[PDB]
Amino acid sequence: SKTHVQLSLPVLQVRDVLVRGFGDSVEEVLSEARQHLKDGTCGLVEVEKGVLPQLEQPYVFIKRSDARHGHVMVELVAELEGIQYGRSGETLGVLVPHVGEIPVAYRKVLLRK
């Protein structure tokens, strides 16, 4: 019922990811990402060169939403064909479904719902 929720997200290496995106439209990927976040079945891939071309568009990014418990404040921004829906701060990673892959870290976030 809150505007923000504390979550700990598993950080996945891109080559381990089994389900490489959330859906087929900007609205769908945002909707599905929010549902997986709520259900604790959302992973995070940190963006490096070569990562994004190995995932499926539209992308869902988590981006830093301000500057000021390790739960960095973030919001969701989708991208399709180089157009972004939402404007925010720096990217912490790209969200993907988590289906039991072994992570390399956990990232604590305070997610704006």
Question: What is the fold's blueprint, element by element?
Answer:
Blueprint: E1 4-11, H1 26-39, E2 42-45, E3 59-64, E4 72-80, E5 83-85, E6 91-97, E7 105-112
Structural class: mainly beta
The helix content is: 10-25%
Describe the biggest sheet? 7 strands, mixed
Oligomer: monomer
- End-to-end distance: 9 Å
| Number of separate domains | 1
The global form is globular
The radius of gyration computed from the alpha-carbon positions, rounded to a whole number of angstroms, is 13 Å
Portion of residues in beta strands equals 35-45%
PDB class: viral protein
Keywords: SARS-CoV-2, Nsp1, protein translation, ribosome, viral protein
Assembly: monomeric
Entry title: Crystal Structure of the N-terminus of Nonstructural protein 1 from SARS-CoV-2
Description:
The protein has one helix spanning 26-39; strands spanning 4-11, 42-45, 59-64, 72-80, 83-85, 91-97, 105-112. With 113 residues, it is mainly beta. The chain has one domain. Strands 1, 2, 3, 4, 5, 6 and 7 form a 7-stranded mixed beta sheet that branches. The longest helix has 14 residues, at 26-39. The chain is globular and about 30 Å long. The PDB classes it as viral protein.
